[PDB]
């Protein structure tokens, strides 16, 4: 039973080694997962910052139309006092000194 | 009888099981620590990898943002200037149409000979009184020379009544006629030495009137 | 075939008793637990009058001793040499406990290259 009792313990050690090696495989997986779950966290933050940049990133016709109400009142005051101004200028020019 | 022991086959198995139990237990605990530390390292490393790159992304974002925050207000500035320019250039396009009609009206007066004749006289007399020279040269439109010749006497009469202190010997109507395109009426009077001229044309008088009237009109219309 | 050799050999004393002599000519590779994280083998030289005691007490000289793992390796006129398998962390406890019972633990720090060299005999 000398070489039989030992064989039992050696088998237990072999089983123990698998347990530890499995945990080492776990760690190895866990370390790659860090690189994976960070690469997914990064390009989602990249597209998100790009998203909120393009939202911010938002034409002479709009400058004329923006003042078409003033360009209309200018000709308005023009049509009224026109004939009364022209009348004075004419009289002034042809007046016998 | 070949095994050296003081224990029953059951006893040796109780002790043999007890040892291989310890071995496995020692392995479970060792493995437990490994995967517990791996979980901690996973979090640490994931965070770091992320923070490395987020600091990079944040950097060029704020530069791109500031860049776009500048172009955003460059347009706001350029639009608000195009607006103030259109307004100003419209105020002028209107005033320069008031004076434009005024000078069409002036041409209309010149083509009414019965209305223009007394005006032309007063324009010629006023000019001669600014000269006060014994001989005066009169430049006029080619279409006015026949009219002017037929009122030389009335002109020399009216002049004598207003300037006895500086008599007028003769009026010379120059054959160098005024330009149809520049002049609609009036005359240009100069002395013989050609050192002095009085431009008393309708266009010139209005031009001089503009000097003071244009700001005045601009003030009363668009104060 | 395999005959014509002297199986009855006359040998002379080249060493002292089992408690002090070199053991390279006495022990075989199979007497030792090799390449184990927990297990190792100790040799104990026991005076013949204490042979009985060792047999029924070695399994309790220290904790973590492999039960029924003892075997007789050799014997002379004064001593019997045993081997015992146990946990490395209990060897110090074991050797001390053995000395107290007037046994004599034989130091023999074997390695894998110091036992593969033993197969050359």
Swiss-Prot record, chain A:
One GO BP annotation of this record: proton transmembrane transport
Modified residues (N-acetylserine): 1
Disulphide connectivity of cysteines: none
UniProt cross-references to Pfam families, sorted A to Z: V-ATPase_G
Primary location recorded for the protein, binned into one broad class: membrane
Further remarks about this protein from its record: Present with 2280 molecules/cell in log phase SD medium.
NCBIfam families with a match to the protein in the record: V_ATP_synt_G
Family per record: Belongs to the V-ATPase G subunit family.
Assembly and binders: V-ATPase is a heteromultimeric enzyme composed of a peripheral catalytic V1 complex (components A to H) attached to an integral membrane V0 proton pore complex (components: a, c, c', c'', d, e, f and VOA1).
PANTHER family assigned to the protein according to its UniProt record, in alphabetical order: V-TYPE PROTON ATPASE SUBUNIT G (PTHR12713:SF11), VACUOLAR ATP SYNTHASE SUBUNIT G (PTHR12713)
Task of the protein: Subunit of the V1 complex of vacuolar(H+)-ATPase (V-ATPase), a multisubunit enzyme composed of a peripheral complex (V1) that hydrolyzes ATP and a membrane integral complex (V0) that translocates protons. V-ATPase is responsible for acidifying and maintaining the pH of intracellular compartments.
Name the UniProt record assigns to this protein: V-type proton ATPase subunit G
The species this protein was found in: Saccharomyces cerevisiae (strain ATCC 204508 / S288c)
Swiss-Prot record, chain B:
Membrane topology value: Peripheral membrane protein
Membrane-spanning parts: none
Result of changing residue 1 to A: Reduces ATPase activity by 11%
Positions carrying N-acetylserine: 1
Example of a GO cellular component annotation carried by this entry: vacuolar proton-transporting V-type ATPase, V1 domain
Subunit structure of this chain's protein: Homodimer. V-ATPase is a heteromultimeric enzyme composed of a peripheral catalytic V1 complex (components A to H) attached to an integral membrane V0 proton pore complex (components: a, c, c', c'', d, e, f and VOA1). Interacts with VMA5; the interaction is direct. Interacts with VMA10; the interaction is direct. Interacts with RAV1 and RAV2 components of the RAVE complex, which are essential for the stability and assembly of V-ATPase.
Protein name listed in UniProt: V-type proton ATPase subunit E
Species whose genome carries this gene: Saccharomyces cerevisiae (strain ATCC 204508 / S288c)
UniProtKB/Swiss-Prot annotation, chain C:
Subcellular location as annotated: Vacuole membrane
Known partners and oligomeric status: V-ATPase is a heteromultimeric enzyme composed of a peripheral catalytic V1 complex (components A to H) attached to an integral membrane V0 proton pore complex (components: a, c, c', c'', d, e, f and VOA1). Interacts directly with VMA4.
Family the entry assigns: Belongs to the V-ATPase C subunit family.
Note, other: Present with 21114 molecules/cell in log phase SD medium.
Its job: Subunit of the V1 complex of vacuolar(H+)-ATPase (V-ATPase), a multisubunit enzyme composed of a peripheral complex (V1) that hydrolyzes ATP and a membrane integral complex (V0) that translocates protons. V-ATPase is responsible for acidifying and maintaining the pH of intracellular compartments. Subunit C is necessary for the assembly of the catalytic sector of the enzyme and is likely to have a specific function in its catalytic activity. Reversibly leaves the enzyme after glucose depletion, causing the catalytic subcomplex V1 to detach from the V0 section.
The name this protein goes by in its record: V-type proton ATPase subunit C
Organism for this UniProt entry: Saccharomyces cerevisiae (strain ATCC 204508 / S288c)
Lineage: Eukaryota, Fungi, Dikarya, Ascomycota, Saccharomycotina
Full-protein positions shown: 158 to 273 of 392
């Amino acid at each position: 039973s000398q070489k039989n009792g030992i064989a039992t313990l050696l088998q237990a050690e072999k089983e123990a080694h698998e347990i530890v090696s499995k945990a080492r495989k776990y760690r190895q997986d866990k370390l790659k997962q860090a690189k994976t779950d960070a690469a997914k966290e990064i390009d989602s933050y990249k597209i998100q910052k790009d998203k909120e940049l393009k939202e911010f990133e938002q034409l002479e016709k709009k400058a004329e139309a923006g003042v078409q109400g003033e360009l209309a009142e200018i000709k308005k005051i023009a049509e009224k006092k026109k004939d009364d101004v022209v009348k004075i200028l004419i009289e002034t020019v042809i007046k016998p000194s | 009888s070949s095994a050296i022991t003081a224990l029953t086959p059951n006893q040796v198995n109780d002790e043999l099981n007890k040892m291989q139990a310890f071995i496995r237990k020692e392995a479970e605990e060792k493995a437990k620590e490994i995967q517990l530390k791996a979980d901690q390292e996973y979090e640490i490393e994931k965070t770091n990898i992320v923070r490395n790159e987020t600091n990079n992304i944040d950097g060029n974002f704020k530069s791109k943002l500031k860049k776009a925050m500048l172009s955003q207000q460059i347009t706001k500035s350029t639009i608000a200037n195009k607006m103030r320019l259109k307004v100003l250039s419209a105020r002028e396009q209107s005033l320069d149409g008031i004076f434009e009609e005024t000078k069409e009206k002036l041409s209309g007066i010149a083509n009414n000979r019965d209305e223009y004749k007394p005006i032309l006289q007063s324009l010629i007399v006023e000019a001669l009184l600014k000269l006060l020279e014994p001989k005066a040269i009169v430049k006029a439109l080619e279409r006015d020379v026949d009219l002017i010749e037929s009122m030389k006497d009335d002109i020399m009469r009216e002049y004598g009544e207003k300037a006895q202190r500086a008599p007028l010997e003769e009026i010379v109507i120059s054959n160098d006629y005024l330009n149809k395109d520049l002049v609609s009426g009036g005359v240009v009077v100069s002395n013989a030495s050609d050192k002095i001229e009085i431009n008393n044309t309708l266009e010139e008088r209005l031009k001089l009137l503009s000097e003071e009237a244009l700001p005045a009109i601009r003030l009363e219309l668009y104060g | 075939e395999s005959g014509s050799m002297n199986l009855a050999a006359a040998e002379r004393k080249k060493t002292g008793d089992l408690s002090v002599r070199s053991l390279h000519d006495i022990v075989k590779p199979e007497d030792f637990v090799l390449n184990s994280e927990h297990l190792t083998t100790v040799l104990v030289a026991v005076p013949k009058s204490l042979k009985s005691d060792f047999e029924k007490s070695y399994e309790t000289l220290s904790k973590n001793v492999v039960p029924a793992s003892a075997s007789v390796i050799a014997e002379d006129a004064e001593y019997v040499l045993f081997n015992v398998h146990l946990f490395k962390k209990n060897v110090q406890e074991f050797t001390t406990a053995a000395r107290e019972k007037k046994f004599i633990p034989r130091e023999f720090n074997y390695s894998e290259e110091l036992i593969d060299q033993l197969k050359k005999e």
